[PDB]
Amino acid sequence: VLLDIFTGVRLYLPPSTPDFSRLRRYFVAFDGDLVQEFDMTSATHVLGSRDKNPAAQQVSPEWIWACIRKRRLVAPS
């Protein structure tokens, strides 16, 4: 009874991100992988912090909840 939503998503989540813990919990619970700050380049997505890796998909907390509501990945936003 754990939804597989973020399968294949390697996300860097800034520790200062509002509601960080809740965000981490659901993202991981729903099959996402977090990336350590050192392995920045291995991230497929990055929340907030755009400068860190321009080549990655830019996302936001809202995008995490949107995906969960739709029960699938939506367009990065």
- The smaller minimum CB distance to other proteins, of residues 27 and 45, is found at 27
Question: Counting contacts by CB under 8 A, is residue 28 touching other proteins?
Answer: yes
Size of the site for other proteins (CB under 8 A): 12
Assign 3-class secondary structure to 21-77. HHHHHHHHHCCCEECCHHHHHHCCEEECCCCCCCCCEEECHHHHHHHHHHCCCCCCC
* Residue selected from 10, 68, 73, 76 as contacting other proteins according to rule CB under 8 A: 68
CB hemisphere CA count around 60 (13 angstroms): 4
**Smallest distance from other proteins to CB 35, Å:** 13
Tell me which residues touch other proteins (CB under 8 A): 1-2, 24-26, 28-29, 31, 33, 65, 68-69
